[PDB]
Structures are given as C-alpha cells and as structure tokens.
Amino acid sequence: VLSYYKVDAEGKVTKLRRECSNPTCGAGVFLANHKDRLYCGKCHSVYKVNA
RNA sequence: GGAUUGACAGAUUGAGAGCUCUUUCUUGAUUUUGUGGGUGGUGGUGCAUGGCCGUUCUUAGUUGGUGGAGUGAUUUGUCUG
C-alpha cells in the first residue's frame, strides 16, 4: 500500500514523489515528503535540501 | 493488496538512546503475538552436594588377615622397662 503510482490513461506511468539520485542505489529508493525536508530512507540522511 | 526491521531532523532525554511521539520513508520471511519448553542468573540454600582449603593435629598415631581371651559390645597384636 504505497499509493504514489501516478498511472494515467494510454498505459503510461510516471513516478509521484520524486525519488533519490542516490549513488548507492540505481535510483529506485523513494524519498519522503516532510516539512522543510524531503528524506531518503536507504541512506537515511542523503539528499535533504528542501522541496 | 505485506510478517517485521531500521532512520536524518524536531519534540523528548544527562545523552545525535527514535527508547517513546510528529512526518513519512527504508527492509521484506529471517521475524512478531500466544501456548508449551528453554536459556541466563555475584538470586537463596555451604544444613542438599562435589572439588579445594583449613582445623581437630606442625602431633605419632591408624588398620586389618590368621590365631588367642570374652555369651557379647570389645580386646590382644599396638607392650613392663
């Protein structure tokens, strides 16, 4: 239950909740929307400059 | 269509222990809940024990086989100098 799919008609999908440009990962781990911060969960402090 | 785990920051806390709360993120069969059953315990019992030690005892004492005495417990042997 992670309802951030953003699937449209046409059979096109793009990703809600813009995700991490993590060097550790292949850009699959999703960031996390808080106030004054968007937060990575795998590397639990990476890429935190505000929205 | 998720068992569960972990986490920046803020509150919080002596304490960048998220322990617990807000925000959501992270991981994904290992765990988690209950039952039985275990493990651990510088917890009790030293009067339930082992082992070790100390002491009786820095002394010269202890024992039995065959015989003898004695109904016997026991004694002689292990002695008078």
A47 and A31 Cβ atoms separated by less than 8 Å:
yes
**Shortest CA to C1' contact from A48: nucleotide:** B8
Give me A46's structure tokens: 């990476």
Dist CA A28 CA A10 (whole Å): 23
A36: left (phi over 0), alpha (psi -120 to 50) or beta: left
A42 C-beta less than 7 Å away from strand B:
yes
User: What are the DSSP E strand ranges found in chain A?
Assistant: 32-34, 37-39
A49 C-beta less than 7 Å away from strand B:
no
Dist CA A39 CA A13 (whole Å): 23
